[PDB]
Design a protein around this ligand. Structure first.
Ligand SMILES: Nc1ncnc2c1ncn2[C@@H]1O[C@H](COP(=O)(O)OP(=O)(O)O)[C@@H](O)[C@H]1O
Ligand SMILES: Nc1ncnc2c1ncn2[C@@H]1O[C@H](COP(=O)(O)OP(=O)(O)O)[C@@H](O)[C@H]1O
Ligand SMILES: [Mg+2]
Ligand SMILES: [Mg+2]
Ligand SMILES: [Mg+2]
Ligand SMILES: [Mg+2]
Lengths: 321, 321
């Protein structure tokens, strides 16, 4: 996947000169959102989809929260440059204009937008049954960050505290491995800790806008990472320094996947393993940061930034990424 | 589709109040781009895909122009609120990450971006074979328009001049009808009026940024319409007044589609029929408008806006929409 993308990223970088010295001049590609220079402030913009989570929603006739996943995926990324989310458009590529599916999608769109503080300002509906085997929901979000208040991770230093905010569950990454591994063996109706497998797989992605905007307005923040594709590897997008981490107990759907033979190092690169968002703050700000985040969701002191460049050591599981 | 979309549109309008009085407060949904209030200017933002034209690219193995279709679909829509395109992200949802395909997609991306004057600032690559039967390429673009310079069509008045700019060909709408009607009977190698069927179907969408930016900076412009889905019906989005039009002769791929049994009333509602972009200007600007446009592409005085309401009379074809 990354080797195929090389040609597109290189070409994209060549277009940057088109907006040189002009409104909207961009930063580099590779971070959680693009930054566009509008003088006093940057506009941040990111585009992200839900993934094959939508195939579970279809089987049980419940798209009621898939719009939450879409909104969460986009606005949580905007947070990772320090931006306040403002607006979103949605791209709905569908096999058919199913009024039942669309009515369900609409319910979660409002719930998500209110929690994220964004207006849904437009969108695109593409009915292409020869191209789409289902209902693929994506979107694009923009937000604003003042010049001088971008948070890319360049301020991360060894000794910084690393704090994790609990995920609500599987979120929207790793669904293809989980679907292929569990559904044929167990059935979608398989009951695990009092909920059906489809409920574990469909649990809507958590939205972190309110705790993170409160955090960055109260304490000095050096890095912010939304845990999506790549798992804990997303931390290396913030800094060259290493991490020493104690990850929380493996529970819920992650335990079920693990007990079905996925190696532990693979799942910390694929699933969020209970931690959906990670923040990096100076050690002296650790307790206030935890107090702020713990108002909103269960949060963990995970560990510390080290001088072991490039390594992520999950000490309590004996895994090094 | 419009029926299935009612609950999504209704719900999206209910989210507008989340940004009431804040940066990014939106205008209404329904137009070619969303308008976001940033004080002295609006940010315009739109999201659009290529459509099943990608199936033709995949069947023949030629992907080096669908990046042009994507960028054209998005930046041409930005023009229709009077905005200058600035930046675009691409959403590439694929069955497989083929490096040859991606290498070609990147050539067309660069050419579209340079002609449109936009930087490609990021994007998203979703590998989902259970959900995608090919290579679906879409994107989101943003532009800027100063307060007091928004061109919505509200200034359109009876008597105004209606000018059409030629398309390059089929552009990116109606491909589902053209593919299903023509390929099984003729094959993609069939020769028609000097070109193969696949060349008729894959001709890249024209980009109108340079002629339209010159036009709005030179003359008074009352409305701008990019001719996409719905064909000439897109004029009804600008105004409730009527139109009296003479459309150019039926040529090339539209002629072959017509000869294969699609009535002209349907094709003026599906295909651009030779006109890719329409502008409405007061009659005293008509000749200067034609001068400017004709320096970029073949353009036509199509007709006038009428005091009569709601109808689009294509006079020389005896058709009323
Ligand atoms: N098709 C694409 N076109 C342009 N840039 C892309 C594309 N896919 C990914 N990128 C860029 O590569 C980086 C990694 O993106 P991704 O792997 O989706 O992670 P994330 O969503 O967390 O940024 C991002 O900065 C993104 O903008
Ligand atoms: N899935 C969606 N969610 C929100 N708004 C949508 C969606 N699909 C279409 N719209 C809105 O409907 C209007 C028409 O959309 P569309 O038919 O794609 O035409 P266009 O690209 O010419 O605006 C646009 O204002 C768009 O923002
Ligand atoms: Mg993302
Ligand atoms: Mg559209
Ligand atoms: Mg469009
Ligand atoms: Mg992404």
């Amino acid at each position: 996947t990354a080797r195929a993308l090389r040609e597109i990223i290189r070409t994209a970088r060549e277009t940057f000169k088109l907006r040189k010295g002009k409104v909207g001049e961009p930063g580099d590609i590779g971070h959680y959102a693009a930054l566009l220079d509008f003088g006093n402030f940057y506009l941040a913009m990111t585009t992200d989809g839900v993934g094959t989570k939508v195939l579970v929603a279809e089987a049980v006739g419940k798209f009621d929260t898939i719009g939450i996943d879409m909104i969460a995926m986009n606005v949580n990324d905007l947070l990772c440059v320090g931006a306040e989310p403002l607006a979103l458009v949605d791209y709905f590529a569908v096999k058919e204009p199913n009024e039942e599916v669309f009515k369900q999608v609409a319910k979660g769109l409002y719930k998500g937008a209110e929690e994220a503080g964004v207006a849904i300002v437009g969108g695109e509906t593409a009915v292409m049954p020869d191209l789409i085997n289902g209902y693929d929901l994506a979107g694009t979000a923009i937000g604003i960050v003042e010049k001088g208040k971008v948070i890319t991770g360049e301020r991360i230093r060894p000794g910084d505290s690393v704090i994790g905010i609990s995920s609500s569950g599987i979120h929207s990454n790793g669904l293809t491995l989980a679907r292929k591994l569990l559904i044929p063996k167990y059935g979608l109706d398989y009951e695990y800790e009092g909920r059906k497998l489809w409920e574990w797989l469909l649990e809507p992605t958590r939205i972190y806008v309110r705790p993170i905007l409160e955090l960055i307005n109260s304490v000095e923040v050096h890095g912010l990472a939304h845990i999506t594709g790549g798992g804990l590897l997303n931390l290396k997008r913030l800094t060259n320094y290493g991490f020493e981490l104690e990850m929380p107990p493996i529970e819920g759907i992650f335990k079920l996947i693990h007990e079905n033979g996925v190696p532990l190092d693979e799942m910390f690169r694929v699933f969020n393993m209970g931690v959906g968002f990670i923040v990096v703050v100076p050690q002296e700000e650790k307790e206030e940061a935890l107090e702020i985040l713990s108002r909103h969701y269960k949060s963990y002191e995970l560990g510390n930034v080290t001088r072991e460049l490039g390594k992520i050591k999950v000490k309590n599981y004996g895994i090094t990424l």
